């Protein structure tokens, strides 16, 4: 019943995970061999070696994906914010699945404002990912994954804690409205029309 050191989100690491899926992770052989005594750099290694895709659960076997297992280990470890930021930045410039992992993790352990602020600029990232759902492996993208994190109640077979809606933060003026790499809709429309007619003749 006692609580381990709490995440900045305000929720203990155990509760945010569902009993079935986490016990399913613990039972898995892959977890038993690869997840014992793993330093941050070592998890980076396990990532770059063994993760070719992203999902919470796969197949009728309901075997947890290495992505989710390493996510769970990272969850238990509860690393500090600066080093995970540096992690997603560097690893991200080098590789995408590391970014996916860090992003999922931050969505789990961090407060709304922080998550929004750090994740939103990565909507620019278009890098292609393969995602294994309950059925088949559908192709997806980093930006789509981020947007999913922000707008979806359940991601990677893990329920997502109800997040304070962004426009609410807007009206309270704690944060400035999201700005895409592109401008407002109308100016994009006008410049694209103009460019099209100009190129065409």
């Amino acid at each position: 019943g006692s609580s381990g050191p709490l995440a900045p989100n305000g929720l203990n690491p155990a509760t945010i995970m569902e009993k079935a899926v986490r016990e399913r992770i613990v039972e898995s052989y892959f977890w038993k061999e690869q997840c014992f005594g793993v330093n941050e750099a070592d998890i980076v290694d396990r990532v770059v070696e063994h993760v070719r895709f992203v999902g919470g659960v796969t197949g009728v076997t309901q075997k947890p994906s290495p992505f989710l297992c390493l996510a769970f280990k990272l969850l238990q470890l509860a690393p500090g914010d600066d080093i995970l930021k540096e992690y997603l930045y560097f690893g991200g410039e080098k590789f995408k699945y590391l970014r996916a992992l860090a992003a999922f993790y931050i969505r789990l352990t961090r407060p709304d404002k922080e998550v929004y602020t750090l994740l939103e600029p990565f909507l620019e990232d278009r890098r292609k990912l393969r995602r294994k759902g309950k059925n088949g492996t559908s192709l997806t993208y980093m930006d789509e994954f981020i947007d999913d994190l922000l707008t979806k109640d359940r991601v990677c077979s893990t329920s997502l804690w109800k997040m304070r809606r962004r426009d609410i933060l807007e009206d309270l003026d704690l944060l400035e409205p999201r700005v895409s790499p592109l401008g407002s809709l109308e100016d994009i429309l006008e410049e694209e029309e103009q460019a099209a007619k100009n190129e065409d003749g």
Partner: peptide, 21 residues
């Protein structure tokens, strides 16, 4: 902390460069 991760990731990258060779 993060610096160790730096060294590890660099090692990995150089390894990948060696693989591409």
């Amino acid at each position: 902390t993060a610096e160790e991760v730096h060294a590890r990731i660099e090692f990995l990258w150089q390894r990948e460069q060696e693989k591409k060779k």
